[model samples]
Target: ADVPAGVQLADKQTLVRNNGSEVQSLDPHKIEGVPESNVSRDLFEGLLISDVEGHPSPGVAEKWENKDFKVWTFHLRENAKWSDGTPVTAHDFVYSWQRLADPNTASPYASYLQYGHIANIDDIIAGKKPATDLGVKALDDHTFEVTLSEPVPYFYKLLVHPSVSPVPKSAVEKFGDKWTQPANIVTNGAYKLKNWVVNERIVLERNPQYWDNAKTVINQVTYLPISSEVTDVNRYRSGEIDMTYNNMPIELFQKLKKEIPNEVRVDPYLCTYYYEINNQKAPFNDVRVRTALKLALDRDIIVNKVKNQGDLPAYSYTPPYTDGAKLVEPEWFKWSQQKRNEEAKKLLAEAGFTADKPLTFDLLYNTSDLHKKLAIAVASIWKKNLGVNVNLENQEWKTFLDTRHQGTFDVARAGWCADYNEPTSFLNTMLSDSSNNTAHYKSPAFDKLIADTLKVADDTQRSELYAKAEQQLDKDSAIVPVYYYVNARLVKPWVGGYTGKDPLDNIYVKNLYIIKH
Candidate 1:
C-alpha cells in the first residue's frame, strides 16, 4: 500500500521541539500549562485520548458507553500495558482520580472532576467528602465506571485533559515526589521518560511495552524548556530545533511566513489571553473601577499592533470558535477609543480616582517575550486613558502559576487553553468554586447559569446558557479580555503527521515521524 498521507519515512525518527517553559511537575495532577501537558501527553494516556482534530479517541479505554450522559463506563483494552510490561488496569484511573481530588494531594486542578459533574467531586474538593468516596470505581480489572451528579454532555472530552491522567500509585507511594524522576517514572503511553535535564530538556523514548508501540512512528522525542519565543526561533534557524513554541516572536511572524511558507503553521486555536483582575482586592472590587479598567483597554492595538500575530481582539471570555458558543461583544468593544477613554475617566472618577489619585496595581505575568510586550502595551494604554499607575511584575512559570492561583496580584496576565472543545470548557472554569479562577471572582448568578447548563442537552439551549454566563463575565469585568489565540508557531518541513489542526494544539509524537525534506 502507498504510504499514509502524513507518512514519509526517512532515516531518523527522533524529534526535538521547544516546550515554552520548565514543567512544574511531571505528576500529571500537579502540573499546569501546555508545556507540562505536552510532555505528559507523551508519557501518560488517560481513559480516553484526543485525536489530531482534538476529538475523543481511544486511549487505555478500548470503548466506552454513556447513559443519558450521566453514567459513563469504560472498557480498558486488554493489550494495553505499562512501561514495566504490567497490564494497564482501570484501578489506576480510580486511584489517580482520587489522588487528584484528595485535599491532601492539593492538586490545583481538583475542580476538574467537578467540571465533569462527577458525583461527590464538589464535596471532595470542598473537604466534605473523602477522596475514596469519589464517583469513579473499577468494576474488575479492565472495566471502569463513573457516576456523575448530573448529565454532562461533554464528559468524554474532559477525560482528555492531562490533569486526569493515571499515575503509578506504587511508584508514587514508594518514591513520593521523586517518583517522577526518569528512573522512577512509570509511563503508559507510546513513549516513556528516558531522561530529564531541569530547565533544559525532557526526553522520551519509544515505550516497547506500549499497546500500540508497533504503530508509534517517532522513536525518541525531546522537549526543550525554553520560554523565549525569539530564542526558540533563533534555535530553529540554527537547526537546533524542530519546532518553535506557539507564541512566535510577533515581530518576526510576517517575515517567517514569507520566508518559510511551507513550515509556517498558523492554525486557529481556542484560547483567551486576558488580565485576571482580583475581584476581591481593593480598586478592582468596585464595579465602576472594574468597568473603567475594562473599557480603557484598547484591544485593537494590543492584538493587531502589539501582538501582530493574527490574534483576534476579544470582548468575551470564551473564544467565538467554541462549539455552540454565542460570540457576545460588549458595547464598549465597538466604541471609539476617545469615547471609551472619556467613559472610563468618568467611571474611574466616580469610583474615587483622578490624576491626584491614579489607580495603581501590579500587573503580574510569567516570563515570556510576548507577555511582557503585551503587558507593556496594555499598561501604556491604561496609563494614557485611565491615568493608572500599574507596576509590571514577572516571575518564572512555576511560581507564577501558584501565585496567580493563590490570588496575590492586582491584575495577572492569564490565558486559558480549553481542556475540551466546548463552551463549558471556558465558562465552567469561572464558577465560584473553580480553583482556576485566579481572579477571585464570585457571582452567584454566574455560578447558577453555569450549573444549569448541565441539564441543558440541546445545543442551542446550552449555548444560550453559556452566552448568559459569558455576558455576566463581561458585565462584571471578571477578566480583561485581550485577544483570542492562534497556533502561531514554526514546524519542520520534514516532520510528518504534524496536523496543527486541533484548536487545542494537542501534539502527539506517536503520530509523527521524521521524513526526507
Candidate 2:
C-alpha cells in the first residue's frame, strides 16, 4: 500500500477525484447518472444513507419504525439544519417526495416513488391527484410518516436513493430552475457546493452547519471530468488526481493490476452492459432479426478479448449474484458457437437478409474508448457471421442519454446498475412502461409477471415470478446481454474509507479521511 515515488499529494486535507463525464444535474429530483448521484449523495441528506457496506444508515432521520407492514414512521434529528441554517424538518422530506412523484416534475425516475408502494402515488403520477395528497405526512416538526399501498420487504433499502432525499423547498422557490446552482443551492449533507465549472471541475467544501460535521474529516474535494480513459489514467499517473471511480480502460486495468497492485481495484458492481434493440422501428421489429443479431455476437470474445478482465459473459439480463432469483440460461443458448452461427444465418435469411440485401442498422453508444472497442467487436461479428451491415455512433454521456430516450436509434448500448440488491431492481427496468426501458420492448406477459411479483409477499414465491419474467425477456430477445460489469478503478492508499463492491459502487466519502504520511 505504499505510494509510488514522486507521487504528488494535496497540501491540505483535500481529495481529488475524476468522473467519466460531467454531471447532468445536481437536482436530486432530476439526476439519472452516477456522476450526478455522487454529487447529490455528498450535497443532500436522504432519510437514510448507505454505510461502508451500502446498507441503510441514519442520516436526517435518527431512527425509524414500522407500526404495521404498510405504515412506517421516521423520527428526524432535531439538530439537522440546512446549510442556510433553516431547520431540517419532517416537512422537508414530505415536500421532496411529493415533488419527485408529481407528473409536472417530469422526472425519469418518478415511477420508483410510485411503484415503491407510495399510497396514491399512481394518481399523483397520472395527474389525477395533487402532490400534496400523496402518502407522506409530517405529523409534527420532527416526525414523518408514510402509508404504503402494500408491504415492501426492503423499503428501507430504497430510502437511501437520492431520488428519495429531501430538497430545500425554500431555495427551489427562490431560484426556480436554477436552485441547484453553486451559489443558490442549500444542502444538508456533510459537504456544500463551492464552485462548479461544467466539464472542467466541481469543488465541494465541508459544511460546518451539518449535524454530523464533527465526524466529517475531509475539508474539501475537487471532482474533475475526464472524458477519455487514456487521459484519466495519465492524470492519475502524473499525480494530477488522487482517485478515479469510473471509465478506466481495460488495458490500463490489467497494467495497473500487475504494476501497482495496491492502487488498482476491481469491485463486484451489480450491473450489466448490454445492447438495446429499438423494437418500435423496422428491421428490429421482427423477432427473427433481433434473435439473429443476438446469436451472431460471441460474448466469450467480448469478455476475454475486448474486456480482458475477469468479467462474466452475460447469458441472462439479471446478473447471477442478484438476490432472491437465479438467472437460468435458456437451453438454446447452451449450444456451441458454430451451431449458433448457423442458426443465426438461417434466422437472418428468414428476415429477408442475404449476401446482397443484408440487414443494416446503426448502433449507438456513449463516447468511451472501451465502448468504442466493444461496439466495433460486435459490429465485426455481425458482418463476419451474418453478413449484416452495422454502423457505430458515439456521443458524449448527456447527449447519448437524450438520444436513447428519444428512441431514434435502431440499436443502442445500455447498462443498468442495481439501485438496491433485489431482483426487482433489474426486472422492473424491463417493464413495458419503465422509464429506463431504452429498448422500447413490449411484452404483455412479461409486464404482468413483474407486476404480480409485487403483490406476493413471500420471498420464495416472488423469486419464482421474477425468474419467469426474466425467461420471457430472453424469449423475446428484448435486449442483447453483452457482459456483466466489474468496477475497475485506482485509489491511493492514503484515501481511506473507499468502499468496494457496494450495491451501486456509491462512494460515501463522509467517513473518508486523508491519512497523509
Candidate 3:
C-alpha cells in the first residue's frame, strides 16, 4: 500500500502532487496565487494556452491572429465541450473577459487586461465604462474578437494565464459565488472537478467531453495542500505524493538530490523572491532608510547559505533571463559586502538614526518553515550589520496576503512569478497604478517608462526603457530584490511527462503518464 510507483501503474494513470499552498479559490476571475492557478489551469480552458514547453498553443481557440498586435481575432474549435456537454463557444470568452475587467467582480487581477492594453479596460476598471463596453466581442458562435488600446507583442503569452480562462456562464449565473463548488462547477479542460475536501484534498477526473480527451494521458489527478516543505518531504518519502512544490527542505536539498538523484528536479523558474518595503509608511518612507536597509542585506548569505538552491542573488527586479530585458543594475551592485555595510551605516546616520536610537521595524512573513528560516537569516544580518532592531511577524497564507495587501507591515515577504515571458510582468506590479502594487511604490519617472513601453515598436527602444525603469527602482530601493527563484523540488521517477522543463513550470496531468518502475 506504500508503493509510490510500480507495476500496473501504467494502467492506473493517476497523479497526486503536493500543491504546496491551499487553493483559496478556483474562479478564474478571483484566483491570485500560483497554487490556485495550478488547479485552475486544469479546470478551465482559455482561447489560447501554453504547452508543457511553455510555448503558446491552441486551446479552445484553434487558431488566432492579430492586426498590428491591437485587433486580435480567435476562432474556437466547434468540438470543444464543457464537462456538462455544452459546446465551448466564443460567447463564453466574451463573458469571461468582461468578468475580469468588471469592477463589480473586485478581482485583484482586474488590472490584468489593462496591462495587456485591452481597449476600454482602464475605463471599465475605473468604473467609467461597463464591462460589456470593454472591447471584446463574439462575432459568431466560433469567432471571438478582442481590441487592444495599443500594440502588445506578448499578448499571446498573456492569454495562456489562468485569469483569462472562460467560465461556464450557465454555472456562474445559477450558483453565483458557489459556482466553483465541486458539485456545481463545469470545466472545459482535460480534467473535471470530482471532489474537494478543502485544505485536505482536491480530486479531478478525466473529462470525456473535452475536445482533446482522447489524447490526454492521465485519467485522474489529486492535489494535496501541504504548505510546509518539510511536511511535503515527509509525505513524498512515504510514497504519499508524486511531486513536491517550489522547494523541498533547503537544508536537506543536497542530501535528497544526492540520495534520489533521478527523482530530484531543479528547473530554472521565472520568479523572484524579494522583501517589499512599505514606501508609504514612516521610517521606511525615508529614502535613506530604504536604501540603507537594502544595501545592508547580505543577499549572498540569504541565497547561498539559507536558500542553497540554484537561485541567483537578484540585484535587479526582472530576472536576467527574461525575454527582451537586459540585466540592469545600480553602481552599488558590484560593491563588496564590507563596503555595503559601511555605506548602510552612513546612510542610516544621515537618516537621523544612530547606534543608540536604531531603526526598529517588523519583518512580516507568511507561515512557512522556509520563509521563517529566511526571515530569521535576513533579520540577523540587519541587526549585526546595521544595528537595526528587527522583529519577526508571521501569519498563515491567506491572512498574511490580506495583511500585506492592506499595507500593515513595515516590510513584508514577497515573490512575483512572471505572468508572461516579458519584463513588464515583473516590472508592472511596481507601477503606482498597478492594483497589485502592495508596496505602494511610486515614481513619476518609473510610471512614464512603463507608459513609454507601449509606444515603442523596436526591441532596443523597449529594452532601454526597461533598463531605465530597473535603474530607477534600484535607486529608489522600494523593494529589496533578494533572489531569482529555482524550482528545486522532488518528483517520483515513475511519473513520466512531469519533466517540468518549462521556465514557467507549466505542468499538466494530461501530459503525464505513470509507468511501472
Pairs of residues clashing in candidate 2: none
Off by over 4 Å in 3: 1-9
Q: Candidates ranked by lDDT, best first?
A: 1, 3, 2
Worst 10 residues of 1 by lDDT: 1-10
**RMSD in order of candidates:** 1.6, 3.0, 2.8
CA lDDT, every model vs. true structure = 0.86, 0.84, 0.86
lDDT of 1 by residue, 42-117 (tens): 8999988887777789989989999988899999999988999998898998999999999898887888888887
In candidate 2, how many Å is residue 60 off? 1.0
RMSD of 2: 3.0
Model 1 / residue 79 / CA error / Å: 1.2
> C-alpha displacement of 253 in model 2, angstroms?
2.6
Q: Write the residue-wise lDDT of candidate 3 on 271-335 in tens digits.
A: 98999999999988999999998899998898888878788988887898988888666778789
Superior by TM-score: candidate 1 or candidate 2: 1
Clashes of 1: 0
